[PDB]
């Protein structure tokens, strides 16, 4: 027959019949590349530590989302501040740099 | 000069350090925990084995009267039966065939083969850890067995060392244990005197030869029925055999942290857990002044193909120019990188190769040769082999286990958000100030 035994970093020790105990330790030979493209790095650090890698990726996504939301909110507030006085008055001879910048 | 450090309790793995005095050449210090012995203090509660149910020969007074007396045997059981009229070989052993009383008697003792196949019940207390250490400093090596408690010192003829306490207390032995032919079990045996039939410890005694044997096997005698003389009884099974059948795996195959449970005395040897704080009073004669050690004029490190495995994966080469021929000590100043060598011969000019084990994807650590440092920078690939038959000699950190490429990516992605919020805040402040100016 064949028996599968998971071996962690702490190690494992198996005794088969009358033989002396045999000890084996798991390396960190995950499939991937820590010095390659981002997907290879994510695969390598997900196979070693899935929970930690998932936490890091979720945190990075949240940081990107909140940064983008903050930038959009600040740009829109700047548009309000620098445009609402000119929208309440006639003949808004506006230098078009502001509108061109924050229209997109 | 006293040096205090915190070695990891992992037998067979040297821990290396460089003690650096103010005005003396740096001295190597390698410490190996050759063996350990986590030994508790035990007191024998009792010994037990298969009981031999000895049945004294029956007696008959068959037109008198008999009364059951009280004895001091183990699980003594006595009864008086009436009309029996027993036969032995002539068909009649009695007169006055009625009112024919017989005394039935039975008790238990230790079986003849119990001097080998017996179990001992023990209660254990706080375990004391004692470590045999091999410590090499400079050129001199010393072996010493020292108690890990924080006070008791180990001494080798000039060297004093005090170790302990262990960072995290641990003991594989539960409060109550049983020893049988060298096999240790964490069984909750009944307390002395609280015998229960059909279970372990149903028969108890202070020793194999003790005459104060006490047992409770639920032996009950029955009234004889067949004409011929015999004494019938029924009794529970030997609790020792029942425990033997349902003993389970011993502690030699269940103790955590992979230490060998040994008997006489009870102990757990070579148990890897926690860290040992050790302070060593290094003798003054060991050090030599820096005016005698060969200072190296310069040194440049280049790392060869490296690999973060459990064994000495990687290698590096130091190209050096010095002023004299000597015995420079080499060290790695990072907590996630350990060299193989400790002292290397040094010439006026040349290059020397050093092997090292690392647990980080990047070999980005400082190597000190005769005190002076060099920053070895490189990239270490993941290991090819999935399983190795040697323990990891370096613990895995968090900030050093993340590769510099992934660190760059994470820093860039976080800095993007940081720059976005900063730019938004600056734009808002500038807009508010411009409004105030043009209000």
Curated annotation (Swiss-Prot), chain B:
Post-translational note? N-glycosylated.
State the membrane topology: Single-pass type I membrane protein
Q: Which residues are glycosylated?
A: 139, 245, 270
Extracellular side, ranges: 13-408
Q: List the disulfide bonds.
A: 49-114, 62-94, 63-96, 68-78, 259-271, 301-376, 306-380, 328-370
Q: Where in the cell is it found?
A: Virion membrane; Host cell membrane
- Annotated region described as E1 fusion peptide loop, given as residue ranges: 84-101
Per the record, ranges on the Cytoplasmic side are: 430-439
Question: Which parts of the chain span the membrane according to its record?
Answer: 409-429
As for what it does, the entry says: Class II viral fusion protein. Fusion activity is inactive as long as E1 is bound to E2 in mature virion. After virus attachment to target cell receptor PCDH10 and endocytosis, acidification of the endosome induce dissociation of E1/E2 heterodimer and concomitant trimerization of the E1 subunits. This E1 trimer is fusion active, and promotes release of viral nucleocapsid in cytoplasm after endosome and viral membrane fusion. Efficient fusion requires the presence of cholesterol and sphingolipid in the target membrane.
* Subunit (UniProt): Interacts with spike glycoprotein E2. The precursor of protein E3/E2 and E1 form a heterodimer shortly after synthesis. Processing of the precursor of protein E3/E2 into E2 and E3 results in a heterodimer of the spike glycoproteins E2 and E1. Spike at virion surface are constituted of three E2-E1 heterodimers. After target cell attachment and endocytosis, E1 change conformation to form homotrimers. Interacts with 6K protein.
Q: What is this protein called?
A: Spike glycoprotein E1
- List the source organism: Western equine encephalitis virus (WEEV)
Report where the shown chain sits in the full-length sequence: first residue, last residue, total length: 798 to 1236 of 1236
């Amino acid at each position: 027959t064949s028996r599968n035994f998971s071996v962690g970093r702490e190690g494992l020790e198996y005794v088969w019949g009358n033989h002396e105990p045999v000890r084996v330790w798991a390396q960190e030979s995950a499939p991937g590349d820590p010095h390659g493209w981002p997907h290879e790095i994510i695969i390598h650090y997900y196979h070693r530590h899935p929970v930690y890698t998932v936490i890091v990726l979720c945190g990075v996504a949240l940081a990107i989302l909140v940064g983008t939301a903050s930038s959009a909110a600040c740009i829109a507030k700047a548009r309000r501040d620098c445009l609402t006085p000119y929208a309440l008055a006639p003949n808004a001879t506006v230098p078009t740099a502001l509108a061109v910048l924050c229209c997109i | 000069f006293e040096h205090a450090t915190t070695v990891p309790n992992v037998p067979g793995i040297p821990y290396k350090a460089l003690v650096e005095r103010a005005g003396y050449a740096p001295l190597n210090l390698e410490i190996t925990v050759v063996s350990s012995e986590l030994t508790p203090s035990t007191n024998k509660e009792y010994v037990t084995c298969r009981f031999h149910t000895v049945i004294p020969s029956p007696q008959v007074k068959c037109c008198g009267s008999l009364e059951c007396k009280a004895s001091s045997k183990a699980d003594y059981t006595c009864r008086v039966f009436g009309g029996v009229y027993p036969f032995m070989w002539g068909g009649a052993q009695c007169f006055c065939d009625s009112e024919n009383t017989q005394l039935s008697e039975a008790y238990v003792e230790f079986a003849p083969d119990c001097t080998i196949d017996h179990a001992v019940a023990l209660k254990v207390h706080t375990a004391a850890l004692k470590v045999g250490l091999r410590i090499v400093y400079g050129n001199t090596t010393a072996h010493l067995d020292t108690f890990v408690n924080g006070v008791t010192p180990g001494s080798s003829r000039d060297l004093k060392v005090i170790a302990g306490p262990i960072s995290a207390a641990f003991s594989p032995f539960d409060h109550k244990v049983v020893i049988r032919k060298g096999l240790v079990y964490n069984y909750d045996f009944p307390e002395y005197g609280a015998m229960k039939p059909g279970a372990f410890g149903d028969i108890q005694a202070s020793s194999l030869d003790a005459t104060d044997i006490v047992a409770r096997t639920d032996i009950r005698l029955l009234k004889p029925s067949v004409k011929n003389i015999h004494v019938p009884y029924t009794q529970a099974v030997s609790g020792y055999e029942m425990w033997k059948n349902n003993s389970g795996r011993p502690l030699q195959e269940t103790a955590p942290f992979g230490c060998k449970i040994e008997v006489e005395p009870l102990r757990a040897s070579n148990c890897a857990y926690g860290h040992i704080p050790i302070s060593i009073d290094i003798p003054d004669a060991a050090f030599v002044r820096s005016s005698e050690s060969p200072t190296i004029l310069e040194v440049s490190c280049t790392v060869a193909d490296c690999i973060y495995s459990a064994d000495f994966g990687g290698s590096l080469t130091l190209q050096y120019k010095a002023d004299r021929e000597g015995h420079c000590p080499v060290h790695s100043h990072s907590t996630t990188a350990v060299l193989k060598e400790a002292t290397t011969h040094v010439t006026a000019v040349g290059s020397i190769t050093l092997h090292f084990s690392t647990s980080s994807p990047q070999a980005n650590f400082i190597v000190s040769l005769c005190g002076k440092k060099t920053t070895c920078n490189a990239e270490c690939k993941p290991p090819a082999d999935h399983i190795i038959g040697e323990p990891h000699k370096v613990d895995q950190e968090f900030q050093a286990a993340v590769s510099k490429t992934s660190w760059n990516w994470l820093l860039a992605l976080f800095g993007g958000a940081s720059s976005l919020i900063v730019v938004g805040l600056i734009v808002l402040v500038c807009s508010s100030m411009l409004i105030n100016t043009r209000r």
